[PDB]
Design an enzyme around this catalytic site. Sequence first.
Site, PDB file in Angstrom:
ATOM      1  N   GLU A 190      -4.827  -1.089   5.825  1.00  0.00           N
ATOM      2  CA  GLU A 190      -3.750  -0.616   6.658  1.00  0.00           C
ATOM      3  C   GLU A 190      -3.535   0.883   6.656  1.00  0.00           C
ATOM      4  O   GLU A 190      -2.466   1.338   7.060  1.00  0.00           O
ATOM      5  CB  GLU A 190      -2.467  -1.319   6.135  1.00  0.00           C
ATOM      6  CG  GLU A 190      -2.730  -2.820   5.985  1.00  0.00           C
ATOM      7  CD  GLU A 190      -1.463  -3.638   5.893  1.00  0.00           C
ATOM      8  OE1 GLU A 190      -0.960  -4.069   6.955  1.00  0.00           O
ATOM      9  OE2 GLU A 190      -0.990  -3.844   4.763  1.00  0.00           O
TER      10      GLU A 190
ATOM     11  N   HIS B  99       4.612   0.751   2.031  1.00  0.00           N
ATOM     12  CA  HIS B  99       4.533  -0.443   2.874  1.00  0.00           C
ATOM     13  C   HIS B  99       4.493  -1.667   1.961  1.00  0.00           C
ATOM     14  O   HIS B  99       3.769  -1.700   0.974  1.00  0.00           O
ATOM     15  CB  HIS B  99       3.295  -0.367   3.763  1.00  0.00           C
ATOM     16  CG  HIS B  99       3.019  -1.664   4.476  1.00  0.00           C
ATOM     17  ND1 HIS B  99       3.900  -2.241   5.355  1.00  0.00           N
ATOM     18  CD2 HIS B  99       1.947  -2.489   4.382  1.00  0.00           C
ATOM     19  CE1 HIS B  99       3.385  -3.360   5.823  1.00  0.00           C
ATOM     20  NE2 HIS B  99       2.229  -3.513   5.228  1.00  0.00           N
TER      21      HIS B  99
ATOM     22  N   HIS C 137       5.403  -9.480   9.777  1.00  0.00           N
ATOM     23  CA  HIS C 137       4.518  -8.745   8.866  1.00  0.00           C
ATOM     24  C   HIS C 137       5.231  -8.201   7.644  1.00  0.00           C
ATOM     25  O   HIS C 137       4.894  -8.621   6.527  1.00  0.00           O
ATOM     26  CB  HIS C 137       3.882  -7.658   9.755  1.00  0.00           C
ATOM     27  CG  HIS C 137       2.854  -6.834   9.050  1.00  0.00           C
ATOM     28  ND1 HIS C 137       1.776  -6.319   9.711  1.00  0.00           N
ATOM     29  CD2 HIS C 137       2.706  -6.467   7.758  1.00  0.00           C
ATOM     30  CE1 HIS C 137       1.001  -5.640   8.863  1.00  0.00           C
ATOM     31  NE2 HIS C 137       1.559  -5.729   7.661  1.00  0.00           N
TER      32      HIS C 137
ATOM     33  N   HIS D 219       5.394  -6.316   1.874  1.00  0.00           N
ATOM     34  CA  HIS D 219       5.719  -7.530   2.598  1.00  0.00           C
ATOM     35  C   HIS D 219       6.900  -8.177   1.850  1.00  0.00           C
ATOM     36  O   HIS D 219       6.879  -9.370   1.561  1.00  0.00           O
ATOM     37  CB  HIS D 219       4.524  -8.469   2.713  1.00  0.00           C
ATOM     38  CG  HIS D 219       3.292  -7.943   3.388  1.00  0.00           C
ATOM     39  ND1 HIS D 219       2.138  -8.698   3.423  1.00  0.00           N
ATOM     40  CD2 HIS D 219       2.974  -6.813   4.057  1.00  0.00           C
ATOM     41  CE1 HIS D 219       1.160  -8.044   4.037  1.00  0.00           C
ATOM     42  NE2 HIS D 219       1.660  -6.882   4.431  1.00  0.00           N
TER      43      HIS D 219
ATOM     44  N   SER E 127      -7.081   1.304   1.752  1.00  0.00           N
ATOM     45  CA  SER E 127      -6.308   0.131   2.137  1.00  0.00           C
ATOM     46  C   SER E 127      -6.711  -0.264   3.549  1.00  0.00           C
ATOM     47  O   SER E 127      -6.897   0.651   4.376  1.00  0.00           O
ATOM     48  CB  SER E 127      -4.818   0.524   2.146  1.00  0.00           C
ATOM     49  OG  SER E 127      -4.124  -0.424   2.938  1.00  0.00           O
TER      50      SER E 127
ATOM     51  N   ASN F 259       0.896  -1.160   0.000  1.00  0.00           N
ATOM     52  CA  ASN F 259       0.000   0.000   0.000  1.00  0.00           C
ATOM     53  C   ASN F 259       0.931   1.206   0.000  1.00  0.00           C
ATOM     54  O   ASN F 259       2.028   1.171   0.565  1.00  0.00           O
ATOM     55  CB  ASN F 259      -1.079  -0.029   1.064  1.00  0.00           C
ATOM     56  CG  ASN F 259      -0.742  -0.802   2.309  1.00  0.00           C
ATOM     57  OD1 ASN F 259      -0.046  -0.270   3.168  1.00  0.00           O
ATOM     58  ND2 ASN F 259      -1.194  -2.046   2.455  1.00  0.00           N
TER      59      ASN F 259
HETATM   60 ZN   LIG Z   1       0.879  -5.186   5.622  1.00  0.00          ZN
END
Ligand SMILES: [Zn+2]
Lengths: 208, 208, 208, 208
Positions: B73, B92, B155, B94, B71, B29
């Site tokens: 998040e 952000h 995360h 992963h 999002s 995001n």
């Molecule tokens: Zn995340």
Amino acid sequence: MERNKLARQIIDTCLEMTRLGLNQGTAGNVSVRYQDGMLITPTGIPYEKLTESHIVFIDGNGKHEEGKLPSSEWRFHMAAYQSRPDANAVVHNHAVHCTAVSILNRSIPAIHFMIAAAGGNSIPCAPYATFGTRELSEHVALALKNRKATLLQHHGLIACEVNLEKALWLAHEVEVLAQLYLTTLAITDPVPVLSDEEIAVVLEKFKT
Amino acid sequence: MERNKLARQIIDTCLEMTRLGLNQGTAGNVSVRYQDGMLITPTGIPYEKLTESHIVFIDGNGKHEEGKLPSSEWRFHMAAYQSRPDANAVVHNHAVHCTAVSILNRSIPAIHFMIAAAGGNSIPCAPYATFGTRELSEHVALALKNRKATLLQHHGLIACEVNLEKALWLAHEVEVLAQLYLTTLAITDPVPVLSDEEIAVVLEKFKT
Amino acid sequence: MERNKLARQIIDTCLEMTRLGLNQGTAGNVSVRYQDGMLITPTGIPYEKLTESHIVFIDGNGKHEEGKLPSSEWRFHMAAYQSRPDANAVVHNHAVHCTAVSILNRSIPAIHFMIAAAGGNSIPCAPYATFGTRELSEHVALALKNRKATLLQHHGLIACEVNLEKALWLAHEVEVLAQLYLTTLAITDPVPVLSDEEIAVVLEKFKT
Amino acid sequence: MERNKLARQIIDTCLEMTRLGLNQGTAGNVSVRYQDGMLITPTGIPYEKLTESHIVFIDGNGKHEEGKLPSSEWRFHMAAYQSRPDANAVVHNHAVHCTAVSILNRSIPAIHFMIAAAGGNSIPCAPYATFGTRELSEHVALALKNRKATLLQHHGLIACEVNLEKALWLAHEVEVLAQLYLTTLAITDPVPVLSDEEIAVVLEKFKT
Ligand SMILES: [Zn+2]
Ligand SMILES: [Zn+2]
Ligand SMILES: [Zn+2]
Ligand SMILES: [Zn+2]
């Protein structure tokens, strides 16, 4: 929702799978639920040479269309569809990380909260059986009772979902989880995991 | 500095992120500081299907535009902007190496002099909290007080900077540092590091 | 052999380097011997935004062209050219495998016969010194006396050769050797090597 | 089945090999059985600069065409063709995973059922000998008596098959098996394997 539109999507998924690094050579097979059986990729034919007319229809009795040879692994696609009525597409491949975890015969535990995408706190690993046999089919049907993806010992991965896009997406996510697990396992054993209570909250949030 | 120009840049960053190997599936995001809040990517929608009108405005009170779902998040993007007034863009994702280090719950120490790009002699790892909660937001705001990037336990990664180009660049550099750390950690533990005096010189040179 | 043709080649090498996976972000710098000094990439400017007029000329006294800022690491390019009169191009990057080996402060031994491409039975690792300093330059000049490539502790790689094509090629080969070394080191320490007599034969065959 | 059609296929295989991540730099060499000898890639010339007229014919006596320099490793291509009359194409490369296993001087055991594609329950590793020598040729001919692919200690891989498409496919599959082996070996030694009876069934199924 015509056969030709569904056959294009199968072919597009095969291509995307290769683009994503999940499919090497002639390894994967993809299917969609159709009428009383399914449409699946054929055996042999390289992915890039695949045309719509290559896609094979297999009825609910296991009779395949005349003049075509379905994937050699069609039996566990049919096992998936009968074990999970909500599944409409099945993606199978021999992605490297998933396959390496399947060689160790380990389930992937809850090392990351995205493990909840397959339905629970783990990705199981069903025991080895020769490819294309009824024995393999039974292990797969049992592994998918409460999970949408499973590893296959000494073999690879199967993921199922409501459509091809989601099935591919899950298969890719499980390959990431496998890579995370192997990278961390090489450093520390066992790998830290999230508790069942925490996975329980993440599963409720994923419903919302 | 119009909304449509900023929304294109967000989308271009998402694409570049996927091209760089940092974003898999629907994981990342991206946001930019805008007016009294921010513009962020929406929840759900695949990156390649993203159009300018999909970008969501969230005001400083946390009210989001009508008919769009930000999002899931977004709360820690808003936490970043309030904790670091100099931050104008937040990335952000992963990314696999960063996420594997976050699973071990380790900070990345000064194994390479480029660690100074995030502001100090380390990349911190903020403790786990469920995604989208206020608890997670508070850990992120505390980790970013003196660092421009932080890992998130179990995360992934958050990186912030003065614009999207730099934010992406930092996020990529931290993924390289994570990969360097995991590769060397598998061989020797602990990994040789540069002293604080040496990082102090590199930080002064980076100002110059 | 005009400036504009040489500046295109520098830019093409930067691009190819990024395509090969050796250059991440703004890390590498490339130079060619020219007139009494060299042409080098500038500091700051992203690789993809690079135009011919961005390339910087630095004379043999270290004076750089007006209005341009040379790479922050130009001093060790000049050190390479003065230490190895046969070198006409220098490639520097922070390739992940080479950099991980440089963190362990290890030379790469003769695990594969292609190690002879850099001139001997090893790839050395020169001790750490702050980037852009005279101290770093002296370590580099000493490491390149009998080798065409060297690792730089906690930093990366430098490779030199008779033209850019060969310099890039060597830099890529050393990244493969680094990857081979780290992959095998994680399994067994020490790694089996070829004897000096065998490297001696391979070096004679490479002359032929 | 004209020379020019066969030379295009060689060149296409070199390109595909580089695209697949199996060929780095000027490492691989590819040949096809032709008339009384073979057509092979030349020595030196980068893959992307390869034109049809660059391909070299070497007769069954080892005399090569006038004005061309065959690959420096042509002798073990000729060894392959004489040891395996059914082989019509040979692919050699220095793929990273295969080469790392060859450094440990290990055969790849039956960690996955696809190992049967090379003819048995393993991929052998032939002992080291200087490149281009008769000694190397003899080890290769002995390793290929009952296998279609072999590792070469401290060197790389050779795979042979009935045509180039299949030879490339096998070479790629062996690089996957090597990667599977190294990834699992870093975690547990020894790696779980399938029994000889199970490989026996898979081999019979592969005939069918
Ligand atoms: Zn995340
Ligand atoms: Zn399979
Ligand atoms: Zn540098
Ligand atoms: Zn070779």
